[PDB]
Structures are given as C-alpha cells and as structure tokens.
Amino acid sequence: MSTAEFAQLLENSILSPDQNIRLTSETQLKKLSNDNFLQFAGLSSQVLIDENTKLEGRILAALTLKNELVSKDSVKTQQFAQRWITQVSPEAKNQIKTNALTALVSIEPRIANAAAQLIAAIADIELPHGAWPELMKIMVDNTGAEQPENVKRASLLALGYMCESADPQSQALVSSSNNILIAIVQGAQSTETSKAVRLAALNALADSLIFIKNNMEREGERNYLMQVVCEATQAEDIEVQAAAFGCLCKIMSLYYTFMKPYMEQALYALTIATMKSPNDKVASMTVEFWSTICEEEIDIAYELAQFPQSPLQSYNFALSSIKDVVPNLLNLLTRQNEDPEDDDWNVSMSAGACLQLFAQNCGNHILEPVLEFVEQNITADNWRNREAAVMAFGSIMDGPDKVQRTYYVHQALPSILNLMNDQSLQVKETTAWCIGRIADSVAESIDPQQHLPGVVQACLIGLQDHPKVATNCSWTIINLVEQLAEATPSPIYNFYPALVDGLIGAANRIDNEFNARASAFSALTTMVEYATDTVAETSASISTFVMDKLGQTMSVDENQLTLEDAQSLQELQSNILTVLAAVIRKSPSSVEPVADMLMGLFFRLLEKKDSAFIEDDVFYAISALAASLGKGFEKYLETFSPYLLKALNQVDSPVSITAVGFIADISNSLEEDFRRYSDAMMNVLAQMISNPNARRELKPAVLSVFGDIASNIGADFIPYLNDIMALCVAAQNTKPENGTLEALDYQIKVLEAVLDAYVGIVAGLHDKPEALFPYVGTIFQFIAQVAEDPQLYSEDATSRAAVGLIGDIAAMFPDGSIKQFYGQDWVIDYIKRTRSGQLFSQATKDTARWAREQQKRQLSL
C-alpha cells in the first residue's frame, strides 16, 4: 500500500458518509494492524508528515496510531506496549519516531498537537525500557532560546502530555526529571517573548510536579524553580499569571514541607495582595492557593491524630494569616454574578469555599472577623452584601466549637429566617443553604419550640419560590430530617404532614429547572426512609402520589416528545421509581395487594422503547418488590426471567450489576426456596465473570453474590466451594492495576467483595466445618490484609465482618485443629483495636468481644 491510499483508507473509516464504506475501511485497517503492525504504524507516520495529504487525514493518522499504542484499559495498554516492542523493528520504530518529531515542528498547530500526543504515547512504552535516549535531549534542544516559537510550544506540550499519561508512580520520568525541568524552565522564564510558550511551559510544569521530587529536594534547584514561577505571576498576560498561581497551588499541594522560606520571603505577601486583583480568574487562583494550604494543614492535623507519632508537621500558615486573608475572602464574596441564573463558577464561590476551609482548620479563630462582617452586612441595602453575610455565616458552621456555634445560631437565626422574604433571588437561595448548614452541623441549636416551627415554615416558603431556592430548601429538609430523627423526644415528626405536603407540591412543578423537582423527589425518598408508625397517613400520601405520578408519565406518547421533554420525562420517571422502590422497602405491608399491578407497570416500563435509561431504576424497584414478597414473588419469575437473563448478560452495562443485585435479593428472600434456582444461577454467574467484555464494577458484584447464594443454600454450595474459593484467592492477591487512586479504590472494592463472599460461605457452611477446613489459612491471609490496610480496618462494617469471621471460624473448629492461628500477635492485637476503636459502633465492639472469647477458647484447646 502507498501513503496516499492509506490516507484515503483513514478518511473513509469515519469521514465518509456511506456507512458501508465505513465498516469495510474500519475492518481493513484492523486486519492491517493485526497482520502487519509495522506497516500500519509506518504508513500512519508518513501520512502524518505528508504535506500533500489534507490536514484532518494527517491528524487522523496520528490519533489512530496513538490509539493503537495507548489505552485506558490496563490489559490493552500492556498488549499494545508488547506489540510495539516485539512486532516493530528498531529501524521502523526509528523512522516512526523521527516522523513524529518532524510533525511536531509543523507550522500548523493542529498537526504539531496530534504529533505531541503520539510522541507521548510512544514515550509511555519506550522510556521505561530506556529505548528513546534521544528524546529528553531533543526536548531540551527544542525549547532552547534560539528555537522558533512553534518548536518551543509543541515540545512543551509533548512533555506536558508525557507527564499526564505516565503512571503517577513510574520511575522513567523521575530518572529524566532534570531534562524535563530544564526544558520547562527554558520556556517559563521571563526572557521568553511568547505568551503561548510560557503558558505551555507552566502547564507542562504542573503536569511534571510529581516526577520532579528529586530536584525539589535540592535547595538550589528548588529556589530557582520557585523564583521562575513567582516571576511568572508578574507577567503582563493574565493567562500566564493564573497558570503561575496554578503552579504555586500544585507546588504547595505536593511540596508543603519546603514552603516556609518561600512564604516568608515572597509568597505570603504576593498571594494576599493579588487577592485584590481585578481579574476574576487570577484572584480565584490565589484563593485556591490558600484553600490548598488549609487542606494540607487539615490533613496534617488528622495525621497527628491517626498516627500521633507521625513525621509531618504544620506551619500554621492559615492560622497566622487570618488577619490578612480572611478580610480579603469576605470582600470577594461580594463578586457574585449579576444574573441570578448564571451558575458559572467565579471568585466569590472560591472565597466562600476557602472561608469554609479556614473555619475547619482555624476553628474559633475565624469567629471574630466573620461575625463582624455578618452583622455589618446582613441588613445592608445592597443584595450583594446581604447574600455575602449569609454565605459567610453558613461557611463557619463547621469548625468553631459547639458552644460558640450554638450561641451565634440562637442570635442570628431569626434574622436569617426573615431573609427568605428578601427580594433578591441570590439572597434567598443562599439563605436556604445557610439554614441547611445550621441543620446539618448544629441541629441541637434549633430549639424544637423556639426555632423549629420557623425553620420548617421558611423551607415551606422556599419550596414555593424560584427553582433555585426550592432546590436548596429540599436539601435543607433532608438535613433537618436526617439530623432530628435520632432525638429521644423527636420533634420533626410533628412537621411531617406539612413538610411532605410542601415537597409533593414541589415535586409537581412543570419541569426540573435548576434540579428543583429532582431535589424534591430525593427529599421524599428521605421522608419515606425516616417515617415512623406514627406518620403512616403521610407515608401513605407519598405512595399514593408516586403511583399517581408514575401512571401519568406512562400515558405520554414518547414519539411526540421534544428533545428537552424527552430528557425531562426520562428523569422524572427515574425520580418516581427511586421513591417507589423506597416505599416498597419501607412498608412491605401495603405491597402484596398492589403486587400484580406494580409488576404489570414494571414490565411495561421494560418494553418502553427508551427502557435503557430507566431499566436500572425498574430493576431496583422489582428487586425491592422481591424482598417484600419473599415466596410470593416466585409467580413472576417465569415472565421476568427473560428480562433478567438478558440484563445479566449485558456485562458492559450497569443494568447487569443491578441484575446481580436482584439475585442477592431473591436468595435472601426465598433463601431455601432459592435452592432450586441456585445451580442455574451459579452457571450464569461463572460465565459473567469469565467474560472479558465485562464492566469492572461487576467483578465485585459477582463475588459478593456468591456469599449470598452460599449463605442461603448452605451445604448444597459445597460442590461449588473450590471454584469460588479460587476466584476469591486470585482476587485477594490481585494488586492495583496501576498507581492511580482509581485503581486503588477498585482494589479495595474487590477486597470488600471477597470479604462478603467469605462471610456468606462461612455462614452457609457453619454446620459443615470439614468442607471449609482447607481454606481457613487462606481466609486468615485475607483477614491479615484487613488488619494491615487502613482503607479496610477503619471501616466499621469491614472490621465487624472481619472480626466476625475470626470468631465464627473459631466456634466452627473446637477440636484445636486451627488453634495456632489464634495465638498470633496480629490476631490478638487486631481484636483489641476493634474492641477499643473510638469510631467503631457498639455492634462492632460486641462482635470483637465474641471473637476474643472464641480466641481465648482456642488457646485452652
């Protein structure tokens, strides 16, 4: 094939309006990437530099090559990397790299950009292996003083892209961090004519910061970088200014420990002075700088409480600066958007957020300046000042001590509730939020007789106001109820009928503008969840309403709906279904007569042409109906089964995770009438986890439902025991697929599922210890991971379950055949931590006592 006809092949694969030409070209290209990757990659690179091929064809060549080298799927990235390494000759790789570097210098920024991404993808693969030694040197060369502006810019973009796409824990970019910094500092220095080069250099700098820790440990290099970034804040271009403050933020975020000298010599005064900048975004960046300081200092204070001996150490920057920073935060609150419906982020929102962080970090120290400003401005004639006063007051409701907050709530609450009558939409919106902050953080300060009637009334007024106010009032009512339903004389239930009535009115508005209708439905979910036998009449009001409202949506001809109304109907039904599921669950008492009617609607909803959007919500309501009926659900199983088996096998769709949740629901609701579907469910589940096309969230879901099945079928599970235990072992030994926070949190989810599997299996087999024996050591390996990993043990339910397994396995083996596991220090000590752990519940402590008693029994044997 020639360059020209490979170009035409790419253009056809999407840029052709014939669908059939498209599929054929797509397919031919895939065959080509598979049969001869060398030639595929080669031709891509020479289409990219072909000055005779049209722009988008050259750009396509780069981005389609890049997408054959690099992926967000870990196994695919590992596969693409091995293909490039083994299937392409070093000589061909050389030409492709050379071509990518030629395209990088294109005077056409769109070409130089796609080349930048491609260079970064090749670097991803090659730098870890020490292939491409020339690259970092070329990047230093390309950013050098004498280079064209475009060469400098595109090279900084490439380094930028390199740093982004690299694994955050990788060693390649760390080992060449000097040359990364040289190139970046060459573009970011004030000696540079181009605002585009400086911006690119500072943007690349932010991306590089994690990889330059070795340069940051050296005083001379750290001093020089800080000098460069500070000088950049003094640039005439205001985009360069924000980017430099952006770097200062990130640097503070990652290198807090080196910041004291720079704060003292330059940064404290600089950042506090440009807080007064007329440029919203620059003023925002300095506010974010201080937000970062607070965040760092809050984390340090939490580290000296978790591990009281710890190395790290606060410098109390925020606390020292209150006299300068806070008054500047207060003035910035008055920079709200003129349009009350504008929503877009601005410095006044940055300030509010920073002020909240200052209250959390600095505590009672924040009180004096803020309360002053609140008193000064709550009765002011400018709406900007009255809204700023309520923002400021709501911002200090978390942090100061309980005695201070309770006192100032008492003083201020009447004047705050009066502001619900204000003529400014902005004031009322913020007032509604401030009441929710009071309710959420200082609920005890709301006297049931003195304050609560007025608080309820204000929420009722706001639900009837503009949607922006109504949305905040719903979330406030949620806070109110969540907080005041635990009280021993609980006063919130007296207001249930009127609150529920206001929410029903609000859920009934014409649309969901500013999320006011959806808010009201969520609030109704809370009302249903928290209801008591005392408020059955008003709980029946909600159920009547949502049934009524569901039947109204289903009579609509969807064919006739506009783009906006289609979107709006979908989400309304979603909202209705969510409350309905809660109703079914909270009160399985009213459920069995309407059950044939409910299921008739749910099936109809699954036939509804746009069922994809609501099928999740429908499945969740069916699940709730199942749990409510137990055996009474079985009659629906044969008509529902077709839908269920289809959803289960949609392994790349979130409905399959919900469908697994359904098996968990019926196994628990039928439990031993469940035995007869169990073998067939086991086979289906084994194929769903074997499937490569599976959504990642499904592995945890499938592993957990094995525990539910085992729990409910008991000794019948034994033939499946070895297969399931092998999936759990392989799961518990799987490390994070990379160094990101997302891969880590997924590892934790898998481990939490393995725990659920072990819990179910032990319970189902508690009368069959011989079957479980060979796996006891493996279950203790997993327990040792819970005791070692903080993201596991510090979780109440995870610790209760793990220590519950310790004690249950003990009771299961009174013969002393596993007693050696029970004389281990780690086991004894982990039991003691769960017993003591200040932030564990009394159910978690009782479970640890039980494991301790069982453990002591084991030592006697």
CSV table of C-alpha atoms in Angstrom, one decimal, residues 445-811:
chain,number,residue,atom,x,y,z
A,445,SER,CA,-29.2,24.6,68.5
A,446,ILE,CA,-32.6,24.5,66.7
A,447,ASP,CA,-34.9,24.6,69.8
A,448,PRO,CA,-38.0,22.5,69.0
A,449,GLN,CA,-40.4,25.2,70.3
A,450,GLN,CA,-38.5,28.4,69.7
A,451,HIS,CA,-36.8,27.8,66.3
A,452,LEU,CA,-38.0,24.6,64.5
A,453,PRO,CA,-41.5,25.9,63.6
A,454,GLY,CA,-39.9,28.9,61.9
A,455,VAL,CA,-37.3,26.8,60.2
A,456,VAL,CA,-40.0,24.5,58.8
A,457,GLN,CA,-42.0,27.5,57.7
A,458,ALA,CA,-39.1,29.1,55.9
A,459,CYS,CA,-38.5,25.8,54.0
A,460,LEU,CA,-42.1,25.7,53.1
A,461,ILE,CA,-41.9,29.3,51.8
A,462,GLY,CA,-38.7,28.5,49.7
A,463,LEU,CA,-40.2,25.3,48.1
A,464,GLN,CA,-42.9,27.6,46.6
A,465,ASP,CA,-40.3,30.1,45.4
A,466,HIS,CA,-37.9,30.2,42.4
A,467,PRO,CA,-36.5,26.7,41.5
A,468,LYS,CA,-33.0,27.7,42.7
A,469,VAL,CA,-34.4,28.5,46.2
A,470,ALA,CA,-36.6,25.3,46.1
A,471,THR,CA,-33.7,23.0,45.4
A,472,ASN,CA,-31.8,24.3,48.4
A,473,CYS,CA,-34.9,24.0,50.6
A,474,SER,CA,-35.3,20.3,49.7
A,475,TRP,CA,-31.6,19.5,50.6
A,476,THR,CA,-32.2,21.5,53.8
A,477,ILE,CA,-35.3,19.5,54.7
A,478,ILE,CA,-33.2,16.3,54.1
A,479,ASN,CA,-30.6,17.7,56.6
A,480,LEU,CA,-33.3,18.6,59.1
A,481,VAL,CA,-34.9,15.1,59.0
A,482,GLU,CA,-31.6,13.1,58.9
A,483,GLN,CA,-30.4,15.0,61.9
A,484,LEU,CA,-33.6,15.4,64.0
A,485,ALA,CA,-35.0,11.9,63.7
A,486,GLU,CA,-32.4,10.5,66.2
A,487,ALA,CA,-33.6,12.7,69.1
A,488,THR,CA,-35.2,10.9,72.1
A,489,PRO,CA,-38.1,13.3,72.1
A,490,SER,CA,-38.1,13.7,68.3
A,491,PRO,CA,-39.9,16.9,67.3
A,492,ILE,CA,-39.5,16.7,63.5
A,493,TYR,CA,-42.4,14.2,63.1
A,494,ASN,CA,-44.9,16.9,64.2
A,495,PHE,CA,-44.0,18.6,60.9
A,496,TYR,CA,-44.1,15.5,58.6
A,497,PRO,CA,-47.5,16.2,57.1
A,498,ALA,CA,-46.7,19.8,56.3
A,499,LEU,CA,-43.2,19.1,55.0
A,500,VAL,CA,-44.3,16.1,52.9
A,501,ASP,CA,-47.2,18.2,51.5
A,502,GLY,CA,-44.8,21.0,50.5
A,503,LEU,CA,-42.4,18.5,48.9
A,504,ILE,CA,-45.3,16.9,46.9
A,505,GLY,CA,-46.2,20.4,45.7
A,506,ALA,CA,-42.6,20.9,44.7
A,507,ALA,CA,-42.2,17.5,43.0
A,508,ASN,CA,-45.3,18.6,41.0
A,509,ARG,CA,-43.7,21.6,39.2
A,510,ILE,CA,-43.8,21.7,35.4
A,511,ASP,CA,-40.2,20.8,34.8
A,512,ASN,CA,-36.8,20.1,36.5
A,513,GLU,CA,-35.2,23.5,36.0
A,514,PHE,CA,-32.3,24.1,38.5
A,515,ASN,CA,-32.9,20.5,39.7
A,516,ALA,CA,-35.8,21.6,41.9
A,517,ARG,CA,-38.2,18.8,41.0
A,518,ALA,CA,-35.5,16.0,41.3
A,519,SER,CA,-34.4,17.6,44.6
A,520,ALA,CA,-38.0,17.3,45.9
A,521,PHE,CA,-38.2,13.6,44.9
A,522,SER,CA,-34.9,12.9,46.8
A,523,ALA,CA,-36.3,14.7,49.8
A,524,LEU,CA,-39.4,12.5,49.5
A,525,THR,CA,-37.1,9.4,49.5
A,526,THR,CA,-35.7,10.7,52.8
A,527,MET,CA,-39.2,11.3,54.2
A,528,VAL,CA,-40.1,7.7,53.3
A,529,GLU,CA,-36.9,6.2,54.7
A,530,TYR,CA,-37.2,8.1,58.1
A,531,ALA,CA,-41.0,7.7,58.5
A,532,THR,CA,-42.4,6.0,61.7
A,533,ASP,CA,-45.6,4.1,62.5
A,534,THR,CA,-46.7,7.5,63.9
A,535,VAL,CA,-46.7,9.1,60.5
A,536,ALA,CA,-48.3,6.3,58.4
A,537,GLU,CA,-51.0,8.5,57.0
A,538,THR,CA,-48.4,10.9,55.4
A,539,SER,CA,-46.3,7.9,54.3
A,540,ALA,CA,-49.4,6.7,52.5
A,541,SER,CA,-49.7,10.1,50.9
A,542,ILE,CA,-46.3,9.7,49.3
A,543,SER,CA,-47.1,6.2,48.0
A,544,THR,CA,-50.4,7.4,46.6
A,545,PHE,CA,-48.6,10.4,44.9
A,546,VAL,CA,-45.8,8.4,43.2
A,547,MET,CA,-48.2,5.8,42.0
A,548,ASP,CA,-50.4,8.5,40.6
A,549,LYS,CA,-47.4,10.3,39.1
A,550,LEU,CA,-45.9,7.1,37.5
A,551,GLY,CA,-49.2,6.3,35.8
A,552,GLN,CA,-49.3,9.8,34.4
A,553,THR,CA,-45.9,9.5,32.8
A,554,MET,CA,-46.7,6.2,31.2
A,555,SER,CA,-49.7,7.5,29.2
A,556,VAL,CA,-47.5,10.0,27.4
A,557,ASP,CA,-46.7,9.3,23.7
A,558,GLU,CA,-42.9,9.3,23.7
A,559,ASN,CA,-42.8,9.7,19.8
A,560,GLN,CA,-44.3,13.2,20.2
A,561,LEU,CA,-41.8,14.5,22.8
A,562,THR,CA,-39.3,17.3,22.0
A,563,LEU,CA,-35.6,16.8,22.8
A,564,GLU,CA,-35.9,18.7,26.1
A,565,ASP,CA,-39.2,17.0,27.2
A,566,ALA,CA,-37.9,13.5,26.3
A,567,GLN,CA,-34.9,14.2,28.6
A,568,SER,CA,-37.2,15.6,31.3
A,569,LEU,CA,-39.7,12.7,31.1
A,570,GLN,CA,-36.9,10.0,31.4
A,571,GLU,CA,-35.5,11.6,34.5
A,572,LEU,CA,-38.9,12.3,36.1
A,573,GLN,CA,-39.7,8.5,35.8
A,574,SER,CA,-36.3,7.8,37.2
A,575,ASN,CA,-37.1,10.0,40.2
A,576,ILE,CA,-40.5,8.4,40.7
A,577,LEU,CA,-39.1,4.9,40.5
A,578,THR,CA,-36.4,5.8,43.2
A,579,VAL,CA,-39.1,6.9,45.7
A,580,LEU,CA,-41.3,4.0,44.7
A,581,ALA,CA,-38.5,1.5,45.4
A,582,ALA,CA,-38.1,3.1,48.9
A,583,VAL,CA,-41.8,2.9,49.5
A,584,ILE,CA,-41.9,-0.8,48.7
A,585,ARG,CA,-38.9,-1.4,51.0
A,586,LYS,CA,-40.0,0.7,54.0
A,587,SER,CA,-43.5,-0.7,54.0
A,588,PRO,CA,-43.8,-4.3,52.6
A,589,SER,CA,-47.1,-4.1,54.4
A,590,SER,CA,-49.1,-2.3,51.7
A,591,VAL,CA,-47.2,-4.1,48.9
A,592,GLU,CA,-48.8,-7.6,48.4
A,593,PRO,CA,-52.3,-6.4,47.2
A,594,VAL,CA,-50.8,-4.0,44.6
A,595,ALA,CA,-48.1,-6.5,43.6
A,596,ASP,CA,-49.8,-7.8,40.3
A,597,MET,CA,-50.5,-4.1,39.3
A,598,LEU,CA,-46.9,-3.0,40.2
A,599,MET,CA,-45.3,-5.8,38.2
A,600,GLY,CA,-47.6,-5.1,35.2
A,601,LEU,CA,-46.3,-1.5,35.1
A,602,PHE,CA,-42.6,-2.6,35.6
A,603,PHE,CA,-42.8,-5.0,32.6
A,604,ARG,CA,-44.5,-2.3,30.6
A,605,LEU,CA,-41.6,0.1,31.5
A,606,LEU,CA,-39.1,-2.6,30.3
A,607,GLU,CA,-41.0,-2.7,26.9
A,608,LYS,CA,-41.0,1.1,26.8
A,609,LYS,CA,-38.8,2.0,23.8
A,610,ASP,CA,-36.3,4.1,25.8
A,611,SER,CA,-36.1,1.5,28.6
A,612,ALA,CA,-32.3,1.7,28.6
A,613,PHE,CA,-32.3,4.9,30.7
A,614,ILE,CA,-34.9,3.6,33.3
A,615,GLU,CA,-34.3,-0.2,33.3
A,616,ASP,CA,-31.8,0.3,36.1
A,617,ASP,CA,-34.4,2.1,38.2
A,618,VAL,CA,-37.0,-0.5,37.2
A,619,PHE,CA,-34.8,-3.4,38.2
A,620,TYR,CA,-34.2,-1.8,41.6
A,621,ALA,CA,-37.9,-1.5,42.2
A,622,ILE,CA,-38.5,-5.1,41.1
A,623,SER,CA,-35.7,-6.1,43.5
A,624,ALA,CA,-37.5,-4.3,46.3
A,625,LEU,CA,-40.8,-6.0,45.4
A,626,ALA,CA,-39.0,-9.4,45.5
A,627,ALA,CA,-37.6,-8.7,49.0
A,628,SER,CA,-41.1,-7.7,50.2
A,629,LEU,CA,-42.9,-10.8,48.9
A,630,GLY,CA,-40.3,-13.5,49.5
A,631,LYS,CA,-42.1,-16.7,48.3
A,632,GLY,CA,-44.9,-14.6,46.9
A,633,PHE,CA,-42.6,-13.3,44.2
A,634,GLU,CA,-42.0,-16.7,42.6
A,635,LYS,CA,-45.1,-16.4,40.4
A,636,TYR,CA,-43.5,-13.6,38.4
A,637,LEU,CA,-40.2,-15.4,37.9
A,638,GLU,CA,-41.0,-17.1,34.7
A,639,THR,CA,-42.2,-14.0,32.9
A,640,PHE,CA,-39.4,-11.9,34.4
A,641,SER,CA,-36.6,-14.4,33.8
A,642,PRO,CA,-36.3,-13.4,30.0
A,643,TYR,CA,-35.6,-9.8,31.1
A,644,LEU,CA,-33.3,-10.9,33.9
A,645,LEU,CA,-31.1,-13.2,31.8
A,646,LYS,CA,-30.8,-10.5,29.1
A,647,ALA,CA,-29.7,-7.9,31.6
A,648,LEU,CA,-27.2,-10.2,33.4
A,649,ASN,CA,-25.5,-10.9,30.1
A,650,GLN,CA,-25.2,-7.1,29.2
A,651,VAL,CA,-21.9,-7.3,31.0
A,652,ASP,CA,-20.7,-3.9,29.7
A,653,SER,CA,-23.9,-2.2,31.0
A,654,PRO,CA,-24.8,-1.0,34.6
A,655,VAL,CA,-28.0,-3.0,34.4
A,656,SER,CA,-26.0,-6.2,34.8
A,657,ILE,CA,-24.7,-5.0,38.2
A,658,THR,CA,-28.3,-4.2,39.2
A,659,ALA,CA,-29.4,-7.7,37.9
A,660,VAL,CA,-26.8,-9.3,40.2
A,661,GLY,CA,-28.4,-7.2,43.0
A,662,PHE,CA,-31.6,-9.0,42.1
A,663,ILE,CA,-30.1,-12.5,42.7
A,664,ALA,CA,-28.9,-11.2,46.0
A,665,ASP,CA,-32.4,-10.0,46.8
A,666,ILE,CA,-34.3,-13.3,46.0
A,667,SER,CA,-31.6,-15.6,47.5
A,668,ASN,CA,-32.1,-13.7,50.7
A,669,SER,CA,-35.9,-13.5,50.4
A,670,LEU,CA,-36.6,-17.1,49.4
A,671,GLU,CA,-33.4,-18.5,50.9
A,672,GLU,CA,-34.3,-22.2,50.8
A,673,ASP,CA,-36.9,-21.9,48.1
A,674,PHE,CA,-33.8,-20.5,46.4
A,675,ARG,CA,-32.0,-23.8,46.4
A,676,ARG,CA,-33.9,-24.8,43.2
A,677,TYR,CA,-32.7,-21.9,41.0
A,678,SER,CA,-29.2,-21.9,42.6
A,679,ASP,CA,-27.3,-24.3,40.3
A,680,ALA,CA,-28.6,-22.5,37.2
A,681,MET,CA,-27.7,-19.1,38.8
A,682,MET,CA,-24.2,-20.4,39.6
A,683,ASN,CA,-23.5,-21.4,36.0
A,684,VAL,CA,-24.7,-18.0,34.7
A,685,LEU,CA,-22.6,-16.1,37.2
A,686,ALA,CA,-19.4,-18.1,36.3
A,687,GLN,CA,-19.8,-17.1,32.7
A,688,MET,CA,-20.3,-13.4,33.6
A,689,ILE,CA,-17.0,-13.3,35.4
A,690,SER,CA,-15.2,-15.3,32.7
A,691,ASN,CA,-16.3,-12.8,30.0
A,692,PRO,CA,-13.6,-10.2,29.1
A,693,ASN,CA,-16.2,-7.7,27.8
A,694,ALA,CA,-17.3,-7.2,31.4
A,695,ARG,CA,-17.6,-3.9,33.1
A,696,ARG,CA,-15.2,-3.7,36.1
A,697,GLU,CA,-17.9,-2.9,38.7
A,698,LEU,CA,-19.3,-6.4,38.0
A,699,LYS,CA,-16.4,-8.5,39.4
A,700,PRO,CA,-17.1,-7.2,43.0
A,701,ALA,CA,-20.8,-7.6,42.5
A,702,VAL,CA,-20.5,-11.2,41.3
A,703,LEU,CA,-18.0,-12.2,44.1
A,704,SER,CA,-20.4,-10.7,46.7
A,705,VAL,CA,-23.5,-12.5,45.4
A,706,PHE,CA,-21.6,-15.9,45.8
A,707,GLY,CA,-21.7,-15.2,49.5
A,708,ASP,CA,-25.4,-14.5,49.3
A,709,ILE,CA,-26.0,-17.8,47.4
A,710,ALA,CA,-23.8,-19.8,49.8
A,711,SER,CA,-25.4,-18.2,52.8
A,712,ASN,CA,-28.8,-19.2,51.6
A,713,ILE,CA,-28.2,-22.7,50.1
A,714,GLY,CA,-25.9,-24.0,52.9
A,715,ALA,CA,-24.4,-27.4,52.4
A,716,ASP,CA,-25.6,-27.5,48.8
A,717,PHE,CA,-22.9,-25.0,48.0
A,718,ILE,CA,-20.1,-27.5,48.7
A,719,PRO,CA,-19.7,-28.7,45.1
A,720,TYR,CA,-19.1,-25.1,44.1
A,721,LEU,CA,-16.8,-24.3,47.0
A,722,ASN,CA,-13.4,-24.9,45.4
A,723,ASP,CA,-14.2,-23.0,42.2
A,724,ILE,CA,-15.5,-20.0,44.2
A,725,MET,CA,-12.5,-20.1,46.7
A,726,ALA,CA,-10.1,-20.0,43.7
A,727,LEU,CA,-11.8,-16.8,42.4
A,728,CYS,CA,-11.6,-15.2,45.9
A,729,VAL,CA,-7.9,-16.2,46.3
A,730,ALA,CA,-6.9,-14.8,42.9
A,731,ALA,CA,-9.0,-11.7,43.7
A,732,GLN,CA,-7.4,-11.1,47.2
A,733,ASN,CA,-3.9,-11.5,45.6
A,734,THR,CA,-4.5,-9.0,42.8
A,735,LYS,CA,-2.7,-5.7,43.2
A,736,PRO,CA,-3.9,-2.4,41.8
A,737,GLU,CA,-3.6,-2.5,38.0
A,738,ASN,CA,-1.6,0.8,38.3
A,739,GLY,CA,-0.6,3.6,40.7
A,740,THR,CA,-3.7,5.8,40.3
A,741,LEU,CA,-6.2,6.5,43.1
A,742,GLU,CA,-9.0,4.9,40.9
A,743,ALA,CA,-7.1,1.6,40.5
A,744,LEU,CA,-6.5,1.5,44.3
A,745,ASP,CA,-10.2,2.2,45.2
A,746,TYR,CA,-11.2,-0.6,42.8
A,747,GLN,CA,-8.7,-3.0,44.5
A,748,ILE,CA,-10.5,-2.1,47.8
A,749,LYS,CA,-13.9,-2.8,46.2
A,750,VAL,CA,-12.7,-6.2,45.1
A,751,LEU,CA,-11.4,-7.0,48.6
A,752,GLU,CA,-14.7,-5.8,50.1
A,753,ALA,CA,-16.4,-8.3,47.8
A,754,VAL,CA,-14.1,-11.2,48.8
A,755,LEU,CA,-15.0,-10.4,52.4
A,756,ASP,CA,-18.7,-10.6,51.5
A,757,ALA,CA,-18.0,-14.0,49.8
A,758,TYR,CA,-16.2,-15.3,52.8
A,759,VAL,CA,-18.9,-14.1,55.2
A,760,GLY,CA,-21.6,-15.9,53.2
A,761,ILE,CA,-19.6,-19.1,52.7
A,762,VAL,CA,-18.7,-19.4,56.5
A,763,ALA,CA,-22.4,-18.8,57.4
A,764,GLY,CA,-23.7,-21.3,54.8
A,765,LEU,CA,-21.1,-23.9,55.9
A,766,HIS,CA,-21.0,-23.2,59.7
A,767,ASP,CA,-22.5,-26.7,60.2
A,768,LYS,CA,-20.0,-28.2,57.8
A,769,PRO,CA,-16.5,-27.3,59.0
A,770,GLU,CA,-14.7,-30.2,57.3
A,771,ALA,CA,-15.5,-28.6,53.9
A,772,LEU,CA,-14.2,-25.2,55.0
A,773,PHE,CA,-11.1,-26.5,56.7
A,774,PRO,CA,-8.6,-26.5,53.8
A,775,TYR,CA,-9.4,-22.8,53.2
A,776,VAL,CA,-9.1,-21.5,56.7
A,777,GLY,CA,-5.5,-20.4,56.2
A,778,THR,CA,-6.5,-18.5,53.0
A,779,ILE,CA,-9.3,-16.7,54.9
A,780,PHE,CA,-6.7,-15.7,57.6
A,781,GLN,CA,-4.4,-14.3,54.8
A,782,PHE,CA,-7.4,-12.1,53.8
A,783,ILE,CA,-8.1,-11.1,57.4
A,784,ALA,CA,-4.4,-10.1,57.7
A,785,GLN,CA,-4.9,-7.7,54.7
A,786,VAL,CA,-7.9,-6.1,56.5
A,787,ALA,CA,-5.8,-5.6,59.7
A,788,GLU,CA,-2.8,-4.2,57.7
A,789,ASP,CA,-4.7,-1.9,55.2
A,790,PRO,CA,-6.2,1.3,56.6
A,791,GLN,CA,-8.8,1.7,53.9
A,792,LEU,CA,-10.2,-1.7,55.2
A,793,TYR,CA,-10.0,-1.8,59.0
A,794,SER,CA,-11.0,1.8,59.7
A,795,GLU,CA,-14.4,1.0,58.1
A,796,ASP,CA,-16.9,-0.1,60.7
A,797,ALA,CA,-18.7,-2.7,58.6
A,798,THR,CA,-15.4,-4.1,57.2
A,799,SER,CA,-13.9,-4.6,60.7
A,800,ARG,CA,-17.1,-6.0,62.2
A,801,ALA,CA,-17.3,-8.5,59.4
A,802,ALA,CA,-13.5,-9.5,59.5
A,803,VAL,CA,-13.5,-10.0,63.3
A,804,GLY,CA,-16.9,-11.7,63.0
A,805,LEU,CA,-15.1,-14.3,60.7
A,806,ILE,CA,-12.3,-14.7,63.3
A,807,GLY,CA,-14.8,-15.7,66.0
A,808,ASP,CA,-17.2,-17.7,63.8
A,809,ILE,CA,-14.3,-19.8,62.3
A,810,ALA,CA,-13.2,-20.4,65.9
A,811,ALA,CA,-16.6,-21.7,67.0
